Design an enzyme around this catalytic site. Structure first.
Site: not given
Ligand code: NA
Lengths: 36, 11, 252
Positions: C43, C99, C198
């Site tokens: 993402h 992910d 992230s």
């Protein structure tokens, strides 16, 4: 890159390669019901 | 906020 | 990283910074696994709900940093990407399951004392270190509070939590490719990753062969250091065959 890394992976130059420890790694090893 | 980086990295 | 401290120079040599070109801003973190491959969270590149879909031409990889905003002349290297690979079953519709994404650099990188790769875990190491209570470390130039950005790379050590707990803390469907870490409200210790982190690595040090292995990737969470909530990470070992396959199918 693959299984268990690359070859010389995981051994930081300024630490493992000089037998020096960073301040909090003891914490970790201690939580794997102590290491050594 | 970031500092400029050498133009040769954009092109 | 919330309630984390400044890192030491050369403490996380495999930490990468994904930097955007215009505007020049930090996007995510990533790890260096070989001299040509970076590993991040899918993402960070594709998130359609926000029309995020970056391409090669839009990112730079900065390897060797410590400082977030300074071009550490003679210490960091900035590479360009050749190819980006997202997991063919990354689910951005429901829970950010799978992910994970791989980026190949234009040219290989030279390792130094600031740039060195991390190991990717093997079934045995995965099995022995992913137990609840064992601590892992996360790093990043992400935010310091939910709502306050650091000059240096931060580090926090977090404990793995039991899947049931990970599941009874959210309304999202947790799958086998995720794991969560964090202290219980009860354990009077804080820390967590946050926005800006992230894509980075969650690593552990094998007490068996003194090496650092990357077990997870920073994937998601609900807030940053909320009591009663935890952080979820992609399960690298569980997606390792994918890794291998694109590496040997497209390079090394
Ligand atoms: Na929490």
């Amino acid at each position: 890159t693959f299984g268990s890394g690359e070859a010389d992976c995981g051994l930081r130059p300024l630490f493992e390669k000089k037998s020096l420890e960073d301040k909090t790694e003891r914490e970790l090893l201690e939580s794997y019901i102590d290491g050594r | 906020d970031f500092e400029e980086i050498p133009e040769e990295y954009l092109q | 990283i919330v309630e984390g401290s400044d890192a030491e120079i050369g403490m996380s040599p495999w930490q990468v910074m994904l930097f955007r070109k215009s505007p020049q801003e930090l996007l995510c973190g990533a790890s260096l696994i070989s001299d040509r491959w970076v590993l991040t969270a899918a993402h960070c590149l594709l998130y359609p709900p926000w029309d995020k879909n970056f391409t090669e031409n839009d990112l730079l990889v900065r390897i060797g940093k410590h400082s977030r905003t300074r071009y550490e002349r003679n210490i960091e290297k900035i590479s360009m990407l050749e190819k980006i690979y997202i997991h063919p079953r990354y689910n951005w519709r429901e829970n950010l399951d799978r992910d994970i994404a791989l980026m190949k650099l234009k040219k290989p990188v030279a390792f130094s004392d600031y740039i060195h790769p991390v190991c990717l875990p093997d079934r045995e190491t995965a099995a022995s270190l992913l137990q609840a209570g064992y601590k892992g470390r996360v790093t990043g130039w992400g935010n310091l509070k939910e709502t306050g950005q650091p000059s240096v790379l931060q580090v926090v050590n977090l404990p793995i939590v039991e899947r049931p707990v990970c599941k009874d803390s959210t309304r999202i469907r947790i799958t086998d490719n995720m794991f969560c870490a964090g202290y219980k409200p009860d354990e009077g210790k804080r820390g967590d990753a946050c926005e800006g982190d992230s894509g980075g690595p969650f690593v552990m040090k094998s007490p068996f062969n003194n090496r650092w292995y990357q077990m997870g990737i920073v994937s998601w969470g609900e807030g940053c250091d909320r009591d009663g909530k935890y952080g979820f990470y992609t399960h690298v070992f569980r997606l390792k065959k994918w890794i291998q396959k694109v590496i040997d199918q497209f390079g090394e």
